[PDB]
Ligand SMILES: C[C@@H]1CN(Cc2ccc(F)cc2)[C@@H](C)CN1C(=O)c1cc2c(C(=O)C(=O)N(C)C)cn(C)c2cc1Cl
């Protein structure tokens with residue numbers, strides 16, 4: 247049977263939430279949407295409840311709601327944000343107006359736990375281990391995150407980590423920067439290297455002041471693209487630009503990451519390769535010697551594959567709304 251809901255004005259709208267969720271107060275000051283921290287009386291968990299905004303206002307709004315709901319419903323993994331609950335106060339499709347999503351309150355992100363300080367090599371092994379475990383899962387579902395950065399990485403005080411928002415500009419692969427039509431999963435590996443470097447050194451690896459500045463910082467660490475990478479460039483404008491570059495040597499990473507664990511440096515080398523086909527994958531990185539104290543080949547699960555074609559249809563609002571409603575009704579909460 248439907249829970250008892252209660253009405254309580256929050257974020258200058260009337261929230262209606264099941265009574266199980268207690269003590270709602272806003273968090274993140276709108277950086278996350280319309281979100282409140284809550285106490286879930288049923289599970290004993292501190293949770294974040296998100297009231298979707300304007301979810302069926304337009305075709306693109308409707309479409310995006312459906313997508314956010316389907317993605318979250320599909321993600322079931324310790325290192326990826328999933329759903330504890332999804333509800334609407336509506337009894338019918340004709341009543342259906344609002345969607346609320348519930349997940350774990352981790353309560354900080356990566357910056358909020360690091361504060362520009364060098365981390366110990368052991369704490370860096372733990373944090374990167376968890377990103378790569380989570381990313382192995384997302385990638386097995388055939389999803390590319392594309393904007394993996396510290397603000398997208400939720401961390402509790404115990405430094406247990408979940409990846410959020412899955413599918414600044416400082417963590418972005420050069421081809422994402424340059425708006426290449428195609429890319430592979432290892433765009434996210436590039437982001438993990440930037441994150442890992444910054445964790446070890448205390449400092450942002452490529453703090454470009456703008457797009458071109460970033461690119462010059464990247465090229466200066468990893469050399470100008472060699473002959474083999476140039477053979478893979480389609481765009482004549484990009485080709486012309488590259489050849490017009492003054493060639494330069496890849497920097498030695500031992501001299502950039504002075505004093506680091508040599509296994510960390512070895513991993514950084516394998517992640518931060520200009521050519522995306524040549525970067526280590528997440529499943530491979532998880533087997534690298536760097537993570538020996540954490541790697542467990544029997545607890546690094548893969549996802550059932552995910553149909554992105556269902557979310558990129560051109561449908562009517564009412565069609566996307568009735569679909570989204572069926573996702574709500576069909577929700578079965580985790581064990
Ligand atoms: C992933 C959850 C929920 N998330 C929104 C969300 C996503 C999916 C979903 F289904 C429900 C809610 C954001 C609030 C971030 N979030 C957090 O735990 C979080 C929480 C915070 C946060 C706060 O919690 C806080 O300031 N207080 C006072 C509790 C401050 N920062 C910088 C935060 C960063 C994150 Cl990532």
Ligand SMILES: CCCCCCCCO[C@@H]1O[C@H](CO)[C@@H](O)[C@H](O)[C@H]1O
Nearest residue numbers: 420421426428429430478520521522
């Ligand atoms: C300054 C110019 C250097 C930018 C080089 C980025 C090269 C990234 O690598 C390229 O990734 C593409 C995916 O986007 C694939 O099409 C290619 O196979 C791969 O070589």
